[PDB]
Design a protein around this ligand. Structure first.
Ligand SMILES: Nc1ncnc2c1ncn2[C@@H]1O[C@H](COP(=O)(O)OP(=O)(O)OP(=O)(O)O)[C@@H](O)[C@H]1O
Ligand SMILES: Nc1ncnc2c1ncn2[C@@H]1O[C@H](COP(=O)(O)OP(=O)(O)OP(=O)(O)O)[C@@H](O)[C@H]1O
Lengths: 606, 606
């Protein structure tokens, strides 16, 4: 069977991502090359064409706002005409343009070239950085992964996330819903009897609530609901609007035409928001904010709350929906599990606590890392060779699926909160071409909901005297993704044929072109890391020699006058060279190291 | 048997204190009347003579620095000539004076009176505030408690902490060492097999390390070591000294003479220190800092680390000591548990991780609350009627005890890290009067260590022809406190008489006077809470009526013109009165409420 190697769990988040592995009976949340256990979901292309991902990309955002990309999770799997897309792109500094029917991110990638990237490709870059982080930690290549999605992601958003994994060179063995992952983190070693757990997940871009039953490693989602365009970024944007208006009232200046100013303001607003989770006021100060003038304003917690109060209060509606859908009352909830960084907000914690009549949330749960933690546990299970303890997951589809047959019935097919995998079939006996539209959502008229896709039954061949009997099967798989197949029942013949969605999902050929593109940049990453590693080696070697020569009681005391002169000359020459050749290639660093060695050795070996 | 009621667990900390209870199978960490689950270990007396404790005391520190008291845990149980006391009092703004050979805190308590308080009385006020917090949450009186102490507290510091509990009206059922409490928090529900746990506890004033073995609710400390004058406050003081020097060089001004300036600087330094645990830079700004001039400086994380590098590095020595005393090597440690707020410092976490060759600390442990959590669990066990699961604790004495008998031998008695309770006896056959000094510490000459106390055997019978046989017993009890008793073996008699320590600890009579004093203030607290509660009732009633009268589609629409006028008038009159009588007594609020009611009822009942 396939060697899946070490399987990693990746929480692919709107603003931050996080990767973990299950090793030696425990989860390791893996720190990146800057020592951070979470990584900004940012990518950028420098003026010289270098691809940056993560902390480096975020760090140069204000200097390069149009070619820095973030919040791609708010675009992934969506179409151009999605009202959410059209609202969000107004506030993103990078260009987003329509290609056929989808939002593509357009940036300058160097060499005078402009490139348009599918959101899948941007998210694949983030996944690649998480993969690189894991590989660095493990000292070996990673090929397989469990990747998270919001529970309320629709079919296309799920498929697009899986495609991002493929483009990053990952076999995505499982797409896991974020609250379900957090539930595993909470409950893996719990031995407290069967309990109802409410997971309240409010991150940087999305909001999910799921109600689970948990009993000794058996986890079942009973109901889920959410909002895929509600999270910390929206709270930031409410504050930014406030201060842009305030600044215009105070100075007469509208700074929105200035990307650099707006992004400096965004950076400080984010820091202020975080401060306000433990302070009651925060000062926002920006030196030479706009046209030379300084910015200095105070944001009180009360104002932050006021600016966001409708958004904060709206998180209670999905809680009420999952309680109703689970046939439970408030008091039936045994534990409340808060995850996602925005659950650090005091007004959020208060709203949830008050909703549940004073019941306090479960403790010891890191809201930034719990999702990655659970993903890592499921990855450990799928690895096969781990001591995870037993783990059984039963999850559900978030949206009612219904179909509209042109010239046929329109009907509900699979209700929301149905345990997956699940399937439903429909017989078509009409003959000729059959066209079926699939919709997702809870409005009573099926076609008033979100269009998932259009599926055509082309080849129903004759059936002399007999009745046409085409069975179409709609199956939602364990990843929450729909596959439509058809088989002729009248023929008896066995071949189920997959019907492709007319709505233009990435094809395997398109995906492979994106993979090849990604692999070019990955090769650059590899060579850069090797180059920097050998530069670091030369640097440490030279400075070490410098210290030894200066030690009068060891080597510096053993060296003759003459040899000591020669040694110092050689080492200081190499250090000078280093200071002026930081950008040299691997070969040059190696060669300078060996020159220095061939000078030093006949001397120290005396 | 005694009804111990609901037993609370109180972490009595240098800078913050925290109280928990075990109810319904879980620990509740109890929020105070300001919603905070930790409370500043601060007390103050307002110019009008009101005693403030906790958040209110800390809030007015800069306006009243000489009559605000904090860091009493660095004085409790110590003598005047203790080098630690003499060093610390130089940086405390309140007066500390010598009496009973001890440091007493001298403050103005109002009415033109100056009072000197034992450190035990100050800590008793903090314990009283924690008690009040618990009673508010529980809706009933609390009489019994488990109170924490640093593992490395000596005999007198332990006894003084217990006495503080008594003065606060608490029967302290157990004194529990802070790392042992943290270990219970970590391991209560763990089912991972026998493991060695290293608890590294760095709080606001003290540092403890303990190595434990844990196996399914059996917790045994193998070795412990620490520093009772090393913690967050010291790091703050290093930064303080830095900026006072910097300000003097910059302006020529020495602000040390100005208590208000110094305490503003301290407040902002504490804020900055906390910021630097997640940022690399922090801005310290104080408006009208000194003689009208503003303060504005930046503290980098690198500078904070440099200012404290010797202190940070010194925490590794106790780790090495407990590893050696446990006969273990670094790799034998299965879990590292960090507790105490100062373990949030990145350089600290780095030093610990590097010491243990990359081993990461256990996750999901709140460093501010874990000690109170464990104390709450042990309190739950002592309550008797809780479902805590089984819990067995074996703890040790931190210091070697030895004795010096005047005219007799000097000898080690009880080695450090001996499991307690434990006892050791010595026979004296000399007759006359026997004087025994008891010393604590590890220096090879017993009397070079810390003097615990002096004990005299007065009544030794000279029995006819037979030789005197007085057995003196030195017992360390389960609280870690020494009791010295004597019995006559030659007599035969079984009556063991307790020998009182000449180094006079508080006597029961002195303690009861302190209790009576505390109880007067507690009565003031009670009356204030009642008064404020009824003022709040009148307020809410009046404003409620205001809202109802303005509701045109219910009461406002029901009321006649006339009656509405009378209603509005009555309510507005009462609100005016409230706005000018915030300081009215209880019966006045009651009377105004009753008057308003008597006006409103004949009208709304139409
Ligand atoms: N102390 C804090 N106070 C308020 N908000 C915070 C705090 N810390 C982090 N956040 C917010 O949390 C968000 C990031 O949370 P996290 O990374 O857990 O979610 P995510 O995985 O990015 O989002 P999603 O799951 O929605 O894709 C950011 O919006 C950030 O501003
Ligand atoms: N983020 C942070 N970075 C640095 N220090 C912090 C941080 N948060 C809290 N501290 C420090 O932690 C200390 C308080 O810790 P905590 O209350 O757990 O200990 P304590 O019980 O007061 O002290 P002790 O046990 O020594 O008597 C204070 O010195 C505080 O400044």
């Amino acid at each position: 069977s396939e060697d899946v190697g070490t399987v990693v769990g990746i929480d692919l988040g709107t603003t931050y991502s996080c990767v973990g592995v299950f090793k030696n009976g425990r989860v390791e949340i893996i720190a990146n090359d800057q020592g951070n256990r979470i990584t900004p979901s940012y990518v950028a292309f420098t003026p010289e064409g270098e691809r940056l991902i993560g902390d480096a990309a975020k760090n140069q955002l204000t200097s390069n706002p149009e070619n820095t990309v973030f919040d791609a999770k708010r675009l992934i799997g969506r179409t151009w005409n999605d009202p959410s897309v059209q609202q969000d792109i107004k506030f993103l500094p990078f260009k987003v343009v329509e290609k056929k029917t989808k939002p593509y991110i357009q940036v300058d990638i160097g060499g005078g070239q402009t490139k348009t990237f599918a959101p899948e490709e941007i998210s694949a870059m983030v996944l690649t950085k998480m993969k690189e982080t894991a590989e660095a930690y493990l000292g070996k290549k990673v090929t397989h992964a469990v990747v998270t999605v919001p529970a309320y992601f629709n079919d296309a958003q799920r498929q697009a996330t899986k495609d991002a994994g493929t483009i990053a060179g990952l076999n995505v063995m499982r797409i896991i819903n974020e609250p379900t992952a957090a539930a595993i983190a909470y409950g893996l070693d719990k031995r407290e009897g069967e309990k109802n757990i409410l997971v309240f997940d409010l991150g940087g871009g999305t909001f999910d609530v799921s109600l689970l039953t948990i009993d000794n490693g058996v986890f079942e989602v009973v109901a889920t609901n959410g909002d895929t365009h509600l999270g910390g970024e929206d709270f930031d944007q409410r504050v930014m609007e406030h201060f842009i208006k305030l600044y215009k009232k105070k100075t007469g200046k509208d700074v929105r035409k200035d990307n650099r100013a707006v992004q400096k303001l965004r950076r400080e607003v984010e820091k202020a928001k975080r401060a306000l989770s433990s302070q009651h006021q925060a000062r926002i100060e920006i030196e030479s904010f706009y046209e030379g003038e300084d910015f200095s304003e105070t944001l009180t917690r009360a104002k932050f709350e006021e600016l966001n109060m409708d958004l904060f209060r709206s998180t209670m509606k999905p809680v009420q929906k999952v309680l109703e859908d689970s046939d439970l009352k408030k008091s039936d909830i045994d534990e409340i599990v808060l995850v996602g960084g925005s659950t650090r907000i005091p007004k959020i914690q208060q709203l949830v606590k008050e909703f549940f009549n004073g019941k306090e949330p479960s403790r010891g749960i890191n809201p930034d890392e719990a999702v990655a933690y659970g993903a890592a546990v499921q990855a450990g299970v799928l690895s096969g060779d781990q001591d995870t303890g037993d783990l059984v997951l039963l999850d559900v589809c978030p949206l009612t699926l219904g179909i509209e047959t042109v010239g046929g019935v329109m009907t509900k097919l699979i209700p929301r909160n149905t345990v997956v995998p699940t399937k439903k079939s429909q017989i078509f006996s009409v003959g000729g071409t059959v066209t079926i539209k699939v919709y997702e959502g809870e409005r009573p008229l099926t076609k008033d909901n979100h269009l998932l896709g259009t599926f055509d039954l082309t080849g129903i061949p004759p059936a002399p005297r007999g009745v046409p009997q085409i069975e179409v099967t709609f199956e939602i798989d364990v990843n929450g993704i729909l596959r439509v197949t058809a088989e002729d029942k009248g023929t008896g013949n066995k071949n189920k044929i997959t019907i492709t969605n007319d709505q233009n999902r990435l094809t395997p050929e398109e995906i492979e072109r994106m993979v090849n593109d990604a692999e070019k940049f990955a090769e650059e990453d590899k060579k850069l890391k090797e180059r920097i590693d050998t530069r670091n080696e030369l640097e440490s070697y030279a400075y070490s020699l410098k210290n030894q020569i200066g030690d009068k009681e060891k080597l510096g005391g053993k060296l003759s006058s003459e040899d000591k002169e020669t040694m110092e000359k050689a080492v200081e020459e190499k250090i000078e060279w280093l200071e002026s050749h930081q950008d040299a290639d691997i070969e040059d660093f190696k060669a300078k190291k060996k020159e220095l060695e061939e000078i030093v050795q006949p001397i120290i070996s005396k």
